[PDB]
């Protein structure tokens, strides 16, 4: 526990627009055992509603966050829902403020679930990838930080037991997609760091792009996104667990452009929740009314 | 200065803005753009676009050019583009790549990017506008670091100092509710630990070490800290454009970490960069005064 927090009479969650004086955290959040996150406030809101209907609830799924807040926050039974924007720094803001919230509420050993979108490597678009490791662009299982101007690295740890439970569950469901277990690269850029040729700047050839991506695949990487190393390093360090459940929107061994229709992208992006929603129903995420 | 691979594409999809090169005639639609105003919030930049539309004497609503499912918004008022960029360098780089590609297809040359942000102050009172005269990383280096194909790359940051000086001069002739300050700006990849905050969920340093880090920053001329500057000011230069940062402060980090000001006053402070830049754009052919 960050000992400095106890020196505060009131702790302001700036990016969620409330403070420790806004509610009684233990009463309001004490029963939380799952935190579902993704880059889109709209998608995670819709997922929250879907879980509320699964739980047989008939009550408004209200945003707990302030109206001018950067992030949204919903609660359905034992699950918190929040967005995290795009990129490690944005995700870290969510992680700091949400893990503090869990601390004030007395929640222990919570499972963070990132329901994301990603670029696939050697899998068909629309595939769900269950990350079994989260690595940087050098394929190292670490998140890098620069703290007080000094280099710091934090190891990434995926909850492999839950990953295997999810894979097994997928074998007993009727998903119209494949579910693959594999490694996941997190990058600080959508274009150049992910080896895309179609950014506004590109200093490499398709041959060099191919060598980079094929090497990743040969090391077991099956998708690529922008938050995984932050989520799977931070949670472990604050005493919680984390997994990534991300759908693929393109096969990067075939192209860079996201060419699938807006409707198909939206459909694809709901597939992680389709799997995880059933998982939550079977593991006390919701009360099955 | 142009990525040759773009010409391989019959159609270029701007994924995070939800349109393509086939969606409009980019030359016709965007060819007159000479300014791009950005910040972290879609709401704040829309409201700024609206106030510029009023200044330009337009009565019609400012409508989103981006697709409805898009990650970012995009507005246009006369010669000015408006877009949000989320929080952090990777988010900002996505906006930067797709917008500079847009400017390329439209044939726009030498465009000024203006980031209208919020930040933590160093030795200045909350609500102060800082005009960045340099953007540096947490090691106080004027570079943005990237890892491309797994290899380290560094790109120098370049601020349009002429425009900065003009903005300082302009502020001296306006009745602003706040002070305007020229100084250096740190860009960090974290709101909490990388900015030396003691109130994160994790903290591996003491108050003395924080102040030692911040005092060193101040002594190197740093006056505020935010999360996108090194991306904006390295990327624009490299694609043939100019960039400046105009950020208000929401806290004096030499005194504390918590943002204690009310949400309303924060929103008020956050409009102050646009208060100054709005008048600048009016006086420099950003809008057509009708």
Every domain of chain A and the residues it spans:
1-289
List the binding residues of B. Answer: 40, 71, 115-120, 195-197
Task: Go through chain B and list every residue after which a break occurs, taking a C to next N gap over 2.5 angstroms, comma-separated.
Answer: none
Distance CA A184, CA A165 (A): 19
Which residues from A are below 8 Å from B41, CB to CB? Answer: 70
Beta strands in B23-99 (DSSP E): 35-39, 74-77, 80-84
Which residues from A are below 8 Å from B148, CB to CB? Answer: 192-193, 203-204
A259/B89 touch (CB, cutoff 8 Å), yes or no? no
Give the torsion through C-alpha atoms of A127, A131, A135, A137, to 10 deg.
Answer: 0
The residues pairing with B187 across neighbouring beta strands, listed in sequence order, are B226
B237 CB-near residues (< 8 Å, 6+ apart): B156, B157, B158, B243
Phi-psi region of A66 (alpha: psi -120 to 50; beta: other; left: phi over 0): beta
Q: Per the structure block, which two tokens stand in for A240?
A: 């919680």
Do B72 and B16 contact (CB within 8 A), yes or no?
Answer: yes
Which of B6, B14, B155, B190 to probe by mutation at the A interface, max A CB count within 10 Å?
B190
Q: What are phi and psi of B27, to 5 degrees?
A: -60, -50
Distance CA B164, CA B243 (A): 10
Q: What are phi and psi of A244, to 5 degrees?
A: -115, 125
Which residues from B are below 8 Å from A146, CB to CB? Answer: 137-139, 188-189, 194
Distance CA A32, CA A102 (A): 8
The residues pairing with B242 across neighbouring beta strands, listed in sequence order, are B112
Which residues from B are below 8 Å from A17, CB to CB? Answer: 263
Which of A89, A229, A237 to probe by mutation at the B interface, max B CB count within 10 Å?
A89
Q: Please give the method by which this entry was determined.
A: X-ray
Q: What are phi and psi of B206, to 5 degrees?
A: -100, 170
For chain B, the distance separating the N- and C-terminal CA atoms, rounded to the nearest angstrom, is 36
Distance in Å, alpha carbon of A178 to nearest chain B alpha carbon: 24
Distance CA B259, CA B247 (A): 16
Distance CA A144, CA A136 (A): 9
Indicate the CATH number for domain A1-289.
3.40.50.1580
Distance CA B226, CA B117 (A): 8
B74-77 and B80-84 beta bridge pairing: antiparallel
Which residues from A are below 8 Å from B71, CB to CB? Answer: 39-40, 86
B97/A11 touch (CB, cutoff 8 Å), yes or no? no
Instruction: Please check whether the domain covering B1-290 is classified as CATH 3.40.50.1580.
Output: yes
Which residues from B are below 8 Å from A95, CB to CB? Answer: 201
Which of A99, A149, A236 to probe by mutation at the B interface, max B CB count within 10 Å?
A149
| Alpha carbon separation from A180 to A21, A39, A184, B168 (Å, rounded) | 44, 21, 11, 56
| Alpha carbon separation from A196 to A40, A153, B189 (Å, rounded) | 23, 26, 22
Distance CA A233, CA B31 (A): 45
Q: Where are the alpha helices (DSSP H) in B113-174?
A: 161-171
Residue recorded with tokens 């506004």: A200
Distance in Å, alpha carbon of A189 to nearest chain B alpha carbon: 5
Q: How does A98-118 read in b/e, with b if 16+ C-beta sit within 10 Å? A: bbbbbbbbebeebbbbbbbbb
Q: Per the structure block, which two tokens stand in for A287?
A: 């009360």
| Run of H or E including B288 | none
Q: Per the structure block, which two tokens stand in for B253?
A: 């980090």
Distance CA B101, CA B148 (A): 19
Do A171 and A162 contact (CB within 8 A), yes or no?
Answer: no
Which of B90, B98, B140 shows the shortest C-beta gap to A86? Answer: B90
Q: How does A26-45 read in b/e, with b if 16+ C-beta sit within 10 Å? A: eeebeebbbbbbbbbbebbb
Do B36 and B114 contact (CB within 8 A), yes or no?
Answer: yes
| Alpha carbon separation from A161 to A170, A185, A279, B120 (Å, rounded) | 14, 20, 13, 41
R_g (Cα) of chain A, nearest Å: 19
Which of B13, B147, B204 shows the shortest C-beta gap to A258? Answer: B13
Nominal resolution in Å?
1.9
| Angle at CA of residue B38, ends A71 and B158, nearest 5° | 120
**CB neighbour class for B231 (10 Å; exposed up to 12, middle 13-18, buried from 19):** buried
């Amino acid at each position: 526990v960050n000992s400095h927090l106890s020196e505060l009479d009131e702790d302001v969650f700036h990016h969620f627009g409330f403070t420790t004086k806004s509610f009684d955290f233990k009463e309001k959040f004490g029963d939380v055992k799952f935190v579902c996150v993704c880059g889109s406030s709209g998608r995670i809101h819709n997922f929250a509603i879907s879980m509320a209907k699964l739980a047989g609830l008939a009550l408004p799924v209200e945003n707990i966050a302030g109206s001018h807040a950067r992030f949204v926050l919903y609660k359905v039974d034992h699950i918190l829902f929040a967005d995290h924007g795009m990129g490690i720094p944005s995700a870290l803001i969510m992680l700091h403020e949400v893990t503090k919230l869990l601390h004030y509420a007395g929640c222990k050993d919570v499972l963070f679930i990132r329901l994301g979108t990603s670029g696939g490597l050697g899998v068909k678009p629309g595939t769900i990838v269950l990350s079994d490791r989260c690595v940087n662009t050098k394929l190292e299982p670490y998140n890098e930080l620069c703290i007080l101007g000094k280099p710091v690295r934090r190891q990434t740890i995926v909850d492999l037991n839950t990953v295997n439970e999810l894979k097994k569950l997928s074998e007993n469901l009727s998903l119209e997609c494949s579910v693959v277990v594999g490694g996941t690269i997190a990058a600080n850029d959508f274009y150049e760091e992910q080896g895309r040729l179609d950014g506004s700047i590109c200093t490499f050839s398709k041959e060099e792009k191919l060598a980079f991506l094929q090497s990743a695949y040969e090391h077991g990487i099956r998708n690529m996104e922008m938050e995984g190393t932050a989520i799977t390093s931070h949670c472990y360090l604050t005493g919680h667990r984390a997994i990534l459940v991300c759908v693929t929107a393109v096969n990067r061994l075939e192209g860079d452009q996201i060419t699938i229709s807006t409707d198909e992208f939206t459909l694809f992006a709901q597939r992680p929740g389709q799997l995880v929603g059933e998982y939550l129903k079977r593991n006390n995420g919701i009360i099955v009314r």
